[PDB]
Structure formats: C-alpha cells, structure tokens
C-alpha cells in the first residue's frame, strides 16, 4: 500500500488554501457562470475586456491576507469558462489581460507575491471554454489550444505550486488526451501538484493526477487510490455564499462557525480545504470576504500546532459526539465540538457542569492534556486495556468561543 | 380584544432596530458582563474610565449605518450593569463620560444624529447596577438614583423614542416602584415607548413593549382581553456576546439573521439586531458586513417589512412559508428556494415549485416577486381558501434567503 | 418538598399500571369518542346497551395479563363520556350494566380479580358526561349525580386502590365542588389514591403529565402536600379499540416510554382497549408479551428506582435510577454485537459517562445477563465512565440496565 | 428494454412473505447463532435430533401469506448452518429426512402455495458453515451447492423462484454462475432468479437484485441495451431474521406499512420476514403484524400490485408520491392526522393542500380508497400541477399511508 510521493506529502501539509475567483464576470457581480446561464450575447459580454482595468488588484495584499488567514497556497482562476486569460498568452489569444486596459501580467504579479510570503501559487484552468469556437467546431485543435495555454503557464513563471483543472460540464466521452497534457506539465514542472475536479471515473482519470476534489459533506476518510497504485490526495472546497465569483445579491452566506467546522472536518477526513473568495470587478477582496478571513485567521492561528501536520488516526469519539482526533509525530489532539460558554454562580450560560468527552483508541499513558487556546490543563482518566480516554472538556471562558476547541495530549 | 394605542402602533411600524452595546467593557473585548463573570477587582476594572476616549465614536456614521440597514430606531446602552454612564449625569455620579477623557455627552451626539436621519433614539438602562453600593446597601436610595438617572435622560435631550429597561438578574421579589418610575417618564415624555426585559400579568400598566425569545414559535402574547395591548420585540446578536468579544468566532450566518428578521414580523414583533462597538466607539468590520447584507434584504422587503402584519393564513404542510398583510396587499414570504441553472446545468430551482396557503378567500389579479417583478402563476380554490403558486427559484447570481411575493387583489 | 404520605409512597412503588378502556363504544370499534365526534344520534347509539353481553369479559384473565406484564394496578373505565356505567348504580341510572343482557356487576368481578392477583383496582370516572341532560341543562344537579355515582363506587366494593378522574377540563371555569366530592371519597375510602387528569384540590394525590415531559415532574410547593405524577400511553392513536387504526407505536417506543416515566419520577399507565364483548385483542397481547419480558428483566429497579441528580454525557439519552442499596444505569441506543467479519454495530468499546456519582464502585453488571462491565471513575469530579457492551447476538432489550454495587 | 414476461409477473407480485426456519430456530437467539456465538459445531448439529417440525403447517403459512396480501413466499430451504429442509436424495445426511420430522417440508410448502395461488420461492444460502468443502475445497463446494439446487429444480415441479444469499462472502472467487444459473434455466425456465449480491449484474441470468430498504430513489433496472432486471427490498420485524425471543426491538406497524409503500414507490417488490418457532409455528407477534399489514394491503389492492413509479413528484416538504396503473393514477399521502370535531382538535381538520407536479391531463374525480370520500382539487395543466385537499382520517381510523384514486376525464 503506497505512501504519498514527497510533493504530495508536502501538499497535504499545506492544509488550507485560498481559492480566488476573478474574471470578466466579476464586473457584473451575478456569478461566474453569467454568460452561459443568463444567455448573454457573446460579443456584448466580451466587451467587458475593455473595462478590465485591474485598478484595485494588489497581489501583495492578497498574498498577505492569505498568509494571515493561515493558508499555505492560493488557487487563482487564470482562465474560467468565459475563456478570458489573466496572463500574457504570448500571442495565443487576444482575449487576455495584455489586451485589456490593465496591461499587466496578473499571474506574474501573483506568483511573485506568493513567493514573498512563502505560499505556493496554484493555477486554476477551466477546460470547458465558451470563448474559442474551436471548442465545438474543432475539438482536436481546441485540445492543442488548451495544452498550449497550460504550457505558457509552465514555462514563463518559474516553479509552480500546482494546476487545478476544472472539467465540470466537459464533453462526455471525448478523448481529452490527458496523458499528453499532464505529460507536458511533468516535463516542465516536475514538482507541480496536479489537481482535478473530475479525477474519479469509477479509478483515477490519469496516472499523473496528484489530487482529486471531493464534496464537502463527505462523511468518512477519503479515497487514496487502489492498493498497489500511486497515492492520490484529496481536497474539499467551500465558498462563502452560493456562488464562486462575486454575487452582490447572493445574501445566502454560511456562518463563520460552519466555515471553521468545515476546515476542521477536512483535516479529519484527510483532505486539504480551499476557502473561496470572489474578487470585485477591479480585483479587490470584498469587505464580506475580509470578515470571514479575519475570523478564520483567528481560528487557524490557534490551531497552527495541528492544522498542517495533523493526520487522521483510528481513534473514535464516544456515542453522540462529533469530536475527533488528529495525530502528529509528537502529539495527539482532541478536536471538540458543541461546547458552550461558561457563566458563573447564578449566571448559567451552558458550559459550567463537568463535561466528560470520551475517545477509543488511545493505548499509551498520558501525562498532560491542555486546551490550545488558553493552556488550561484538563482532568482525564484512562482505561489502557480498552484504550478509553475520558476528558472533562471545560466550556469556553466568557467572552470567547472557538467553535472547534483543540486539546493537545502530551504523552508520558 | 384591545388594539394598540397610537404610539405602540407607530412602534410596530418601526419593524427593525439596531441595538448598540458600548461601555467600558468594550475596551477588554471579552463580553459586556466581564466585570462580574471574570470576578474582576472593581477598582482595577473601573480604571478603564481613564482610557475611555471615544476617539472613534461618530454618531452620524452610526445613524447612517442604521438608516442604510433599514432600521427605524436605535437602542443605545446609556448605562450597563458596570454602572458607567455614557451621558452627563449632572452631578448624580462621577462614573460618567464627563469624567472620562472623551468629555462629551455621547447621548446628546446620539440623539442629534438620530433626528437628522429620522430615526427614533431609544435608551437602554440596566437596573441591576454593579457600581453603586446603594444597590445592596440602601435599595430605596438606589431606586431614587435609578429614577434620577432616567429623569436626566427624560429632561435634557428633547423628545425620546423610548426606554429599554433591562432587569436581568434583578431582585424579583423587591418593590421596584415602577409606577413612580414609569409615571415620571410619562410626565416628561408622554410619547416614549417603554420597553421591558422582564415585563401572566405585565409588570406595570405603563409598559408598552415586552421582550421575547428569538425562537418563539407562534404569534406573541399581547396582554389579557380587556387590557392594554402590549407589543413584542425579539433581539439577535451576531455571535454569542452583546458587547464586542474578539475571540468569539461563533457568528450566526447572515442567512439566519435574515430569517430571524422575517420571523419576528411573522409572529408580530419588532426585531433588534445587536452590534457591539469597539473600545473607542467604532462599528467593527464584522458588524458592517452583516449590516450590508441585511440592508440589501430590507431594501427589497421595504413594501412589507414595516406595515406587514400577521394574518390567519397558513402555509401547506412541510413548508416554513408565511403571509403578511398590509391594508392594500398580502405578501407571501417564501423560504427554502434554490438558485435556477439552465437546461443541463441544474442548480436546484428549475422545476415547478407549488407552494400553497390556506386562508385567502378573495380573487387574485396578479402575484409577483419583489426582487425582480417576475409574475407568478397561481390557482385558487375560493371555497376552501386555498392559494397555490409556482414559486420560481432565484435567478442565477442572487439568493434572497426569504423571497417575497406581492399579491394584488381584483 | 414534604415527604409523601404513605399511600402516595405506595403508589410511586407501583411503577406501572394497565389502563383498560371498555364501554358501549367498544362495539363500534372506531374509538371511545365516537358518539360525539361522529355526531351520532344519541338514541340510536344508546341502543348499544341491548347488545352489551360482556360475553368474553374475564376479569381473571385481565388480572393475570396485568400481573404477567409487571403492572401493579389496573385502571378500568367504570363510566366514560358516553355515560354508561359498568357497575350497578343501585337506582341512580338505568343506563348501566344491570340493564344490559350482561346483568353482571363488572366492577365487582374486576375488584375480586385484582385482589387475588395482589393488584390495586382503580376506577376511572369521566366527569364530562354525554348521557345525562343534567350536564348542560342543570350543572349543580349534575354535580350531585356525579358525586352519587362515585359514592356507589366508594361503598359497595370494599377498599379501592384509587379513582382516576378525567375531564373537569371541559368546564375549566365552573365550580366543580371538589372539596365535597373528594371529601366524600376521603370519608369512605381514606386510603384511596385520587388521580386527576397550584393543584386543583388538596385531596388530589396524583396529577397526570404528558408522555413527553423532559424533566422530573412537579411535586407541589414547599410546605404543601407532596403530589405524585403519572403518564399514559396507548398503543395506536385511540384509547378504545379502533379496528382501522393501523398507526401503532413500536414496542421499542413503549419500552422507552416506561423507562422514561421512571426517569422523570412518574408512574406509567399502558392502555389497552377491549373488544365489544370484553376480550383483550390479540394486538394488545403482543405488546404485553414484549413489555412483560422487559419488566421482568427490570424488576430490581422498576418499582423502587427513583430519579437522582446524576446526568449523562453529551449526546446520550442515558439516565440513572437510585434505590436504597444500588444505582442503576439505564442505557439507550445500544447495538447488537456481531463477530469478526460480521459487524452489527455494537462491537467496539462504547464509553458512556455520567456525572454525579461520588462514591467508589466495586462492580457494575448488566441485569439481563450478569456480564461485569469495565469502568473508571474520577471521584473529585464525580465522573463514571462505563464500557457499555452491545447486546449479545439474538437479543435487544431497547433499554439496557446496569446495576452498580458500591464498595 | 421491456421486462421478460416472467419478470413483469414478478413485479406484479408486489409483496412476499419471507420465512426463516432452521435448526437455529430452536435456540431462539437469531439465525447466525452458530457462527456469532462461537458454538461447537458438533454440539450445534445435534439440534437435528430434536427437529420434529411438530407445529409446521404449510397450509397455515400459505393462509397467513394470503391474508396479508402477499403473492409469493420465500422459504429458507438451507441457511448458513447448512441444514436442508428437504430430501437431498443422498447429497447429505444433514437434512430433514434424517431428523425426527421425516417429511420433505419443501414438498408440503410447494403444495400449500399452489393451493392458495402463491408462487413458492426457495431461499438458498451460498455461504455454508456445515460442509468442510466450503473452506477446504471451494470448486467441489460449488458442485455441492449446484447439486443441492438441482434437487430443488427437479423434484417439485415448476417453482416460482430461487433466492440466493451470500456470494458476498467470497467477493473475489469465481462462483461459476453461468453453470449454476444455466442449470436452473434448463429445468426451470420460468423461475425467477433473485440474488442478494447481483453498476453491473453478476450474471445475465439474474432476474432480480436486492436493495437496501432505505434506498431513496427509483432502483436500477440495468444498462440501456440489456436485460431489464427487477428489484426487491426486505424488512424483518425486529433486529433478527430467525426467531429471537429476547429481541424486543420491534419496528412499528406504521413503519412496516411505510416500507411496503416505499418499495412500490421505488419500483421494487418487498419481502416481509417472519421467523418460525423451533417446531415451525408462526409466533403470535408475527400474526399481529400480519393482521395490521393485511388491513392496509386489502385497502391498497387497486394499486399495490399493478401500480408503478411515474415522473410525478410531490411538493416541497412532503413525502407523498404517485403510482400509475394503465387506467388510474393514485396519490399515496403520508403524515395525515385524525379529524376531531368542533372544540376537540386532533390535528387533521383544516384544509390540507397537497400538491404534485407532472399530471398534465384533466381530472374528473379523486377519492380516498378507504372510504370513497371525494376530494376537492385544482389543476394548472400548463405547469402540470395538481393540488388536492387531503382531508384527515375519520376519527377511529388511521391508515398511515392513505391512497387517493384519480379518475381521468
């Protein structure tokens, strides 16, 4: 049974990434699929190139914000279904940022900014393309165009963290020549992570795929490939409302609490997680996304000891709880949900009674257990023969609520 | 059954207010009850007065934000349990903003800012006080101190929208001399709404509004049959705390906020959305995000949010939908809709979506969504008072959480 | 809270009773409220007296079935809303069993059968009456009629376990003259338990609570008489037999309900509706057989076990009952244990915790098979954690009970 | 594709009775007791000596099936314990001919089914704990399994079907299904072959595949150019299939009724299981369930057998569904309450609009099957919406799943 290749091991250590949707669609703020979904006249929609100034895009600020949220990589949409490229395609197309008023290779600014902050730059590429008539009219030539667009990314920006391929609504059954495309990527970017949102066709879609995406609600530890074959990692994605590109009248935002639980859940099932934000037309992080990033950032700073290196382990929680354990080489960590805030005396807020939370699968004697957020030592008992650990999971100090609270176990 | 007195009818038309928690506790950003709950030394806590600059308090910005969110009044904490007064108590106490570096009557700034935006200013007053030893040592004198503190508010700021009394953790047995306190308010501010946290029987005839739990399932209680009608109000804060709490990450979804606002109207209550200011008096960025989202919803819902009332029209089994009545229209408030894709791209909302209601007996001419004016198809059975509409899903790129259809009668 | 009077104390030890609905309505088999709810013609409906033979009523079989199910008392409907009396009213009314072909005092047969099986006989009396015009047309005279009907029951059958009064709720404003009614009962039946479906009258011993009440019930104000509590469950949606009511509860929910009643400090009545002629229906027999297996296993705790301030861990429905010698863990949501490849759900260690046990424990064992459980305690925080093993293949008790033996 | 005629007939059966009875029945601690309780094999097998079948009456079994509205019966002819309830004619000594009963139970069973116009089906466990061949010589085990089926195919005349349980034990091994099934086709061309482990069928000869009871959506009928395969779900009354005396964890009759309706909604048959006592009697508990289910299936007879799923969905937040026959549609309506009167409110008295999408034809009349009450309704033919006022139950009744028949113009 295979173990991850070094570059995949590294990918798993990244833990959290920021996904950034930004394209011509951003100017209309009605979702990234607007051209197809709203049946827009193609010519009129493509005129959006003329007002693509990128006047507020600051890759340095974006990389800084990603670092502060505790992300270790960023996936930027280099070309979405609309087919507009955020980089210099060096003559491949006129529908690129060099032909917009911006006149800046935004991908170059992005990679430079990522490097300064020690973040891996990843490139999102949509394979279903609405711009080029090649897609319907001459699919083999389309493949060449797709491949060349990828090749430019592989050869003009230095080492790349990875590629994130999106083939939602792909041509069913057509030959995508993945071995040629992935093969080319390996030749120029041997170390790049290849991610696919259609990497599972029963069975990976190509040997060169490193990561497959999964739905955020996946209950159990994800699939890592057949037992004698290359280990493939997993990734889940969450966007803040219902849309990936900015959508001004989409008010259906998830709670910050659910965001935190999703990040925790991803780690529990052995996947990375991407948190998505949609930039404004001119390239700014919207205020709403800033709020979510600030809250997530406080959680990830507290969870830093386990968020990156923590792995799933055969330790289960007791009946009726959502609690789980993550393992690093030096420690185990209890991730504890559904805690309440502690009041005092007459003021009952919910958390003040003893709160025994049990786990099954810990066989080693424990010296100390403490909450990461405030270093409070927890009392506990063990039955080593049955591998039971029971901790008194105290509630939050008044004035705080971490949503997912983490206790570090220090072994005897 | 009595109907609301005019001032209470005006209150119910306010619909939505903003609650603002700001005090010395704000500087520690660990919740408004920190002094008691964290067992602080009183002297050390009360030193916070020395750094209360209010350097970033701008009542105009706050009034403007309230206007933009669609709120029609603001409840500001004038004195919380900590017992510090945000206004000039004119010698009643040294623990007031006049004795802080800010040196500004913040209530005066607040009332002026409310008037310029046509918002009603409401004053929150805690009756359980941790600062004055009168509270435990000389309760009759405490009553006089409480009453005098309210008297200052009734006499120094012009007409006031209302008072919001918080009796949480009070002495429930004691005689609070409510007739004298409320009576005094009636004398100076005949038109003020009196709201009570702990208003069986109402706690005093002069109470106009009583508070209710956020999740109360059914239309609220308005008082006994021959008695004065009392209105209701629910409150929601964005995380678990009312004052700012920097490490409280447990924020509710904006969607739940919108559903709570709609729910309050559905059960015949006003709703307060609470924000906790920073130590220096700024609206925190997180609160701004929620206000921006809520403001888009309330602008869309303006035709019904204020004048709409509960009416004996129920929704079909398995839905959370409900109806609000104004004098000219009924409005269907429809939940659990999905976004519409196109053809092969299925987002959830594209099939016909029959939503039914029971209790509409009049022939309908037209029904349309407030957000985009799309006309809905519908059928009626007038004898059984059934209405069924095809509630189309959201246009791609939008999601209103609670979608509202206006009914136009023949 | 005062200490319960001895009769009340005895009542709480009864634990489980059988409720029996049987009247003229039983012949129709469309529910006990049929006369009112189906708007029947009163004269035509009352003709059912002419075919009330009680040909299959055997009070001995009923008492035996109650004994076998582990019930300690039986509440029999002596007169329901329909207003027909199952006993000899000695001239009070012609609408009684002595004027039916049965021509037997069924209450007499019932009390004798209860006594021989050592069960307390309780009499159910409906106070909302559809038969006598007095009810609407002359309420004060109705009160006298009601009172006399109870007086017959208090004077003609020897000592009675109790009275179960249903239906003052019909007229919540009216003066029901409870002191005279209850006082009369106290005079002739000082030890009888008075159950009523601030408390309405000082003589009331027991108050009914809904089946779903979450918390330990109310026992009256401090310095006042302690009053007990009782909950009721029927097997489908109706109390009298209802042939086309297919909406029966699971036997599992029945067992959980009985367990729940004890947890909140109440007795529980399980209701059965007899057939027209007075037989226990086959469906009710099935439920009684299943309940009887559970109550036989739970006998150590079912009668004497009382609620105690010991709570269960987050996310479990488990609870604790206290007797003078032992505590008992009542554990829900267990699965059956498979073996090796065959995973049925119960085979991993299953830590279930409780908070409020401060004393060192010597042993814990399941009542059903005597298996000893492993456990750990933290005496300072009063935490007990047991490994609640799953059921042996081939069994499933729904509510499993572990007995704690203290050092 | 169109179902083969034998498969179409199977689908019309709707409901069957599953009967578990073997040596394990004597223990009353579940049918898997020998393995799960780690019993000594020799000691367990001695149970053959007290297998009298003294209370087995195949006519009572057939009668109970008839009364519940079942159209076939699946009897366990050999379970994992490996004991055969029929004469294996020299294949094995571990059969009913070597027990005190001395009668071929299968023969009695087939005769009793034929007299009630029920199809007899034979359940056969392919995972066998008795014969050492199973672990020690799998190819020879296959021959033994096949011969045991051959006896069933050749000694009883035409049979309704075979119900194979347990190739899931060795998921990798070659079970030689073409030879086993081919043999069955040769002697019993019209028999339904059901498989417990059947997006690819395990053999072309399989007619029916089993599915989980809780499957949400209409079942899979096979790839678009290939043989149509039917589906079946199973429910037992408690947690065990064989009798289990101290298993008190019985499902509600209401859940049983909902499961039967659910099977039909998803286009499957349903088997309701009963475990006989040691000596072969139907336990009283099973009789109670049968009687309750029988009242429902008698009321649902117009649609239970011929009703099929159809692209008509119910409104948001209801569990209602529609079944189609050639002459009618039927609304199956859940979560109704009983109707009180005036001040006595039982829950069902207000107008109760229940909607469906996908009916495009004008309707003349709609009425409840249980009492013939006519329902009021409105239609929007352009959007294919039907809304009915689903009145609650008459006091004294509660059908759990209520059925309204639609009569078209």
Short mmCIF file of N, CA, C and O in Angstrom, two decimals, chain B residues 94-141:
data_model
loop_
_atom_site.label_atom_id
_atom_site.label_comp_id
_atom_site.label_asym_id
_atom_site.label_seq_id
_atom_site.Cartn_x
_atom_site.Cartn_y
_atom_site.Cartn_z
N UNK B 94 -19.91 60.45 39.53
CA UNK B 94 -18.62 60.75 38.94
C UNK B 94 -18.21 59.67 37.92
O UNK B 94 -17.21 59.83 37.21
N UNK B 95 -18.99 58.58 37.87
CA UNK B 95 -18.64 57.49 36.98
C UNK B 95 -19.38 57.68 35.65
O UNK B 95 -20.26 56.89 35.33
N UNK B 96 -19.04 58.76 34.93
CA UNK B 96 -19.77 59.13 33.73
C UNK B 96 -18.78 59.69 32.71
O UNK B 96 -17.61 59.93 33.02
N UNK B 97 -19.27 59.91 31.49
CA UNK B 97 -18.36 60.24 30.41
C UNK B 97 -17.78 61.64 30.62
O UNK B 97 -16.73 61.97 30.03
N UNK B 98 -18.41 62.47 31.43
CA UNK B 98 -17.86 63.80 31.69
C UNK B 98 -16.57 63.74 32.51
O UNK B 98 -15.83 64.66 32.52
N UNK B 99 -16.36 62.64 33.20
CA UNK B 99 -15.20 62.38 33.98
C UNK B 99 -14.21 61.49 33.28
O UNK B 99 -13.30 61.01 33.87
N UNK B 100 -14.43 61.24 32.02
CA UNK B 100 -13.51 60.48 31.22
C UNK B 100 -12.82 61.43 30.26
O UNK B 100 -13.23 62.53 30.08
N UNK B 101 -11.76 60.98 29.60
CA UNK B 101 -11.07 61.84 28.64
C UNK B 101 -11.90 62.27 27.42
O UNK B 101 -11.59 63.27 26.86
N UNK B 102 -12.92 61.52 27.05
CA UNK B 102 -13.78 61.86 25.96
C UNK B 102 -14.43 63.22 26.19
O UNK B 102 -14.54 63.99 25.28
N UNK B 103 -14.91 63.46 27.40
CA UNK B 103 -15.52 64.71 27.84
C UNK B 103 -16.65 65.19 26.95
O UNK B 103 -16.78 66.35 26.72
N UNK B 104 -17.46 64.28 26.48
CA UNK B 104 -18.52 64.57 25.58
C UNK B 104 -19.77 63.88 25.98
O UNK B 104 -19.74 62.75 26.34
N UNK B 105 -20.89 64.57 25.94
CA UNK B 105 -22.14 63.89 26.19
C UNK B 105 -22.53 63.07 24.96
O UNK B 105 -23.08 63.59 24.00
N UNK B 106 -22.26 61.76 25.00
CA UNK B 106 -22.40 60.89 23.85
C UNK B 106 -23.87 60.69 23.53
O UNK B 106 -24.24 60.56 22.36
N UNK B 107 -24.72 60.71 24.56
CA UNK B 107 -26.16 60.61 24.33
C UNK B 107 -26.66 61.84 23.55
O UNK B 107 -27.51 61.68 22.68
N UNK B 108 -26.10 63.04 23.82
CA UNK B 108 -26.51 64.23 23.06
C UNK B 108 -26.13 64.05 21.60
O UNK B 108 -26.92 64.37 20.71
N UNK B 109 -24.92 63.55 21.35
CA UNK B 109 -24.47 63.37 19.97
C UNK B 109 -25.38 62.34 19.30
O UNK B 109 -25.78 62.52 18.15
N UNK B 110 -25.78 61.32 20.06
CA UNK B 110 -26.56 60.22 19.53
C UNK B 110 -27.95 60.71 19.13
O UNK B 110 -28.45 60.36 18.07
N UNK B 111 -28.58 61.50 19.99
CA UNK B 111 -29.95 61.95 19.76
C UNK B 111 -29.97 62.89 18.55
O UNK B 111 -30.87 62.81 17.71
N UNK B 112 -28.95 63.74 18.42
CA UNK B 112 -28.91 64.67 17.30
C UNK B 112 -28.74 63.88 16.00
O UNK B 112 -29.42 64.14 15.01
N UNK B 113 -27.88 62.86 16.01
CA UNK B 113 -27.63 62.07 14.81
C UNK B 113 -28.88 61.28 14.42
O UNK B 113 -29.19 61.19 13.23
N UNK B 114 -29.63 60.78 15.40
CA UNK B 114 -30.86 60.06 15.11
C UNK B 114 -31.89 60.98 14.45
O UNK B 114 -32.54 60.58 13.48
N UNK B 115 -32.03 62.20 14.98
CA UNK B 115 -33.02 63.13 14.46
C UNK B 115 -32.73 63.50 13.01
O UNK B 115 -33.66 63.55 12.22
N UNK B 116 -31.45 63.70 12.67
CA UNK B 116 -31.11 64.08 11.31
C UNK B 116 -31.39 62.96 10.31
O UNK B 116 -31.57 63.26 9.14
N UNK B 117 -31.47 61.70 10.77
CA UNK B 117 -31.74 60.58 9.87
C UNK B 117 -33.17 60.11 10.02
O UNK B 117 -33.54 59.06 9.49
N UNK B 118 -33.96 60.83 10.82
CA UNK B 118 -35.35 60.47 11.07
C UNK B 118 -35.47 59.10 11.75
O UNK B 118 -36.41 58.35 11.50
N UNK B 119 -34.53 58.80 12.66
CA UNK B 119 -34.60 57.57 13.45
C UNK B 119 -35.00 57.93 14.87
O UNK B 119 -34.59 58.96 15.37
N UNK B 120 -35.76 57.06 15.52
CA UNK B 120 -36.10 57.25 16.92
C UNK B 120 -34.95 56.80 17.82
O UNK B 120 -34.46 55.67 17.72
N UNK B 121 -34.45 57.69 18.73
CA UNK B 121 -33.44 57.28 19.70
C UNK B 121 -34.07 56.60 20.90
O UNK B 121 -35.02 57.12 21.48
N UNK B 122 -33.57 55.44 21.28
CA UNK B 122 -34.06 54.69 22.43
C UNK B 122 -32.91 54.53 23.42
O UNK B 122 -31.78 54.34 23.05
N UNK B 123 -33.20 54.62 24.70
CA UNK B 123 -32.17 54.48 25.69
C UNK B 123 -32.25 53.21 26.50
O UNK B 123 -33.23 52.94 27.13
N UNK B 124 -31.18 52.45 26.50
CA UNK B 124 -31.07 51.24 27.29
C UNK B 124 -30.51 51.60 28.65
O UNK B 124 -29.58 52.33 28.74
N UNK B 125 -31.16 51.14 29.68
CA UNK B 125 -30.75 51.35 31.04
C UNK B 125 -30.76 50.05 31.82
O UNK B 125 -31.77 49.42 31.87
N UNK B 126 -29.64 49.65 32.40
CA UNK B 126 -29.61 48.44 33.24
C UNK B 126 -30.09 48.78 34.65
O UNK B 126 -29.64 49.77 35.25
N UNK B 127 -31.01 47.98 35.20
CA UNK B 127 -31.49 48.32 36.53
C UNK B 127 -30.68 47.57 37.60
O UNK B 127 -30.62 48.02 38.74
N UNK B 128 -30.06 46.44 37.23
CA UNK B 128 -29.11 45.79 38.12
C UNK B 128 -27.74 46.44 37.91
O UNK B 128 -27.13 46.33 36.83
N UNK B 129 -27.24 47.12 38.96
CA UNK B 129 -26.10 48.00 38.85
C UNK B 129 -24.99 47.46 39.77
O UNK B 129 -25.27 47.22 40.97
N UNK B 130 -23.77 47.30 39.22
CA UNK B 130 -22.64 46.75 39.97
C UNK B 130 -21.80 47.87 40.59
O UNK B 130 -20.92 47.58 41.39
N UNK B 131 -22.02 49.12 40.17
CA UNK B 131 -21.09 50.17 40.57
C UNK B 131 -21.51 50.80 41.91
O UNK B 131 -20.69 50.89 42.80
N UNK B 132 -22.77 51.27 42.03
CA UNK B 132 -23.21 51.99 43.21
C UNK B 132 -23.48 51.03 44.36
O UNK B 132 -24.30 50.12 44.24
N UNK B 133 -22.85 51.23 45.54
CA UNK B 133 -23.17 50.39 46.70
C UNK B 133 -24.61 50.54 47.20
O UNK B 133 -25.07 49.70 47.96
N UNK B 134 -25.31 51.59 46.75
CA UNK B 134 -26.72 51.77 47.11
C UNK B 134 -27.52 50.53 46.77
O UNK B 134 -28.50 50.21 47.45
N UNK B 135 -27.12 49.83 45.70
CA UNK B 135 -27.91 48.72 45.18
C UNK B 135 -28.16 47.69 46.27
O UNK B 135 -29.29 47.29 46.47
N UNK B 136 -27.11 47.25 46.97
CA UNK B 136 -27.26 46.26 48.04
C UNK B 136 -27.49 46.92 49.39
O UNK B 136 -28.21 46.35 50.19
N UNK B 137 -26.91 48.11 49.62
CA UNK B 137 -26.83 48.69 50.96
C UNK B 137 -28.05 49.54 51.32
O UNK B 137 -28.36 49.70 52.49
N UNK B 138 -28.75 50.09 50.31
CA UNK B 138 -29.83 51.02 50.56
C UNK B 138 -30.75 51.09 49.35
O UNK B 138 -30.77 52.07 48.62
N UNK B 139 -31.54 50.03 49.18
CA UNK B 139 -32.31 49.83 47.97
C UNK B 139 -33.25 51.01 47.69
O UNK B 139 -33.28 51.52 46.57
N UNK B 140 -34.01 51.54 48.68
CA UNK B 140 -34.82 52.73 48.47
C UNK B 140 -34.05 53.92 47.89
O UNK B 140 -34.55 54.63 47.02
N UNK B 141 -32.82 54.13 48.37
CA UNK B 141 -32.00 55.20 47.82
C UNK B 141 -31.53 54.82 46.40
O UNK B 141 -31.37 55.70 45.56
#
